[PDB]
Design a binder for this molecule. Structure first.
Ligand SMILES: NC(=O)[C@H]1CCCN(C(=O)Nc2ccccc2SC2CC2)C1
Ligand SMILES: [Zn+2]
Length: 139
């Protein structure tokens, strides 16, 4: 679990969005596994606007942060799960690192701010949904 809180927005994994997220929906994209809802309180986070390919992510199944080298956002095949049919997920970045069910929502950050959130994983890999192209999150 986990979310990004920026301005009057909450960014979560679409497959983990709550009834309240859907009732306050701003934007969602099943192909990116992202959903953004509106909040009444001002958020705690700031978003990176960069092309960093190194950063640090929070891994809840180890209660630890790990440094990672990650690929540029791209279209990657994701096998069927309880949440989605087999499909290509867009704006996804892979890295070698631990992740298991429950780790989605963990934040990936570089020196410039929040880059994205854990969205996929397995076999010593961890995949992050990028948020750096969502310029409207800042206004
Ligand atoms: N974005 C998606 O389509 C997600 C939806 C949730 C399921 N899924 C996924 O990869 N979950 C997962 C997360 C972290 C580590 C391992 C796993 S699955 C298995 C132990 C290796 C695909
Ligand atoms: Zn950066």
């Amino acid at each position: 679990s986990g979310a990004i809180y920026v301005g009057n927005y909450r960014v979560v994994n679409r497959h983990l969005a709550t009834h309240n997220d859907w009732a306050n929906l701003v934007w969602e994209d099943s192909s990116r596994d992202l959903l953004v809802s509106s909040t009444t309180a001002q958020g705690c986070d700031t978003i990176a606007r960069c092309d960093c390919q190194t950063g640090v992510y929070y891994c809840s199944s180890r209660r630890k942060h790990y440094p990672v080298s990650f690929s540029k956002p791209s279209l990657i095949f994701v096998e069927a799960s309880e949440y989605y049919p087999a499909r290509y997920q867009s704006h996804l970045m892979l890295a070698v690192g631990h992740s298991e069910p429950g780790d989605c929502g963990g934040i990936l950050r570089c020196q410039h701010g929040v880059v994205g959130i854990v969205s996929t994983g397995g076999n010593g890999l961890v995949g992050f949904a990028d948020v750096r192209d969502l310029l409207w999150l800042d206004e």
